């Protein structure tokens, strides 16, 4: 571990500094180091980890989509043969993305999930596991593509089952899990009806629980509820 010689607290401090400087690859490396210290993560630390890798992989996904679009056009009937370069460079970005996903999935498996007992941590990490198998699924084409999709589904399902038993319907982790599992259904599993049903039911059950919340909790919950409505508007 290249971070093995830095104090855990210094790694967390520098992750926060990297965030302020918009240096998300550094932020991710610092949080990987903090995870590898072996202690459980606080709520703030879990979100620092998630924010860092979501930003890194988000940029990779954006790049991969640009390149995949160029590649698909280069292969159309009538296009001029550009040679292997577009495929090669899309594969390079794809391999780097898969590497980041494998790294995050490795942290979750060694050993964040197994030590996560509280709903707020365990649901958070299982949602992450679903998210990073989803990103792998977005680029998958081989013998194990259906297994990748099912790994995402299984992680999301375990998170959903815990969230429904242990969290109120307005809990923002529960809401964000349902948002993303709904996108999984729509974009990955070819199940738009399941995606719409999940988003609508999640929204309506949250709506009915808002009356229990403080102003600050209400702001947090309605923020995610609006993303659910946004997706429903896109899909209907």
């Amino acid at each position: 571990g290249a971070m093995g010689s830095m104090e855990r607290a210094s790694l967390i401090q520098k992750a926060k500094l990297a965030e302020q400087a918009e240096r998300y690859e550094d932020m991710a490396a610092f949080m990987k180091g903090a995870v590898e210290k072996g202690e459980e993560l606080s709520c703030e630390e879990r979100n620092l980890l998630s924010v860092a890798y979501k930003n890194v992989v988000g940029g990779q996904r954006a790049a991969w989509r640009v390149l995949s679009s160029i590649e698909q056009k280069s292969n159309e009937e009538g296009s001029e043969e550009k040679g292997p370069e577009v495929r090669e460079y899309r594969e390079k970005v794809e391999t780097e993305l898969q590497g980041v996903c494998d790294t995050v999935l490795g942290l979750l498996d060694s050993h964040l999930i197994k030590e996560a007992g509280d709903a707020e941590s365990r649901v958070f990490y299982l949602k992450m596991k679903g998210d990073y198998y989803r990103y792998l699924a977005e680029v998958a084409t081989g013998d194990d593509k259906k297994r990748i999709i099912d790994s995402a589904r299984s992680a999301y399902q375990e998170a959903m089952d815990i969230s429904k038993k242990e969290m109120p319907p307005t809990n923002p982790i529960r809401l964000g899990l349902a948002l993303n599992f709904s996108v999984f259904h729509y974009e990955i599993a070819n199940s738009p009806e399941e995606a719409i049903s999940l988003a609508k039911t999640t929204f309506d059950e949250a709506m009915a629980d808002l009356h229990t919340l403080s102003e600050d909790s209400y702001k947090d919950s309605t923020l995610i509820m609006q993303l659910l409505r946004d997706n429903l508007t896109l899909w209907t």
Binding site: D131, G176, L179, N180, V183, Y186, E187, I224, L227, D230, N231, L234, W235
Partner: peptide, 5 residues
Amino acid sequence: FPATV
């Protein structure tokens, strides 16, 4: 793309 968090 749809929203995720």
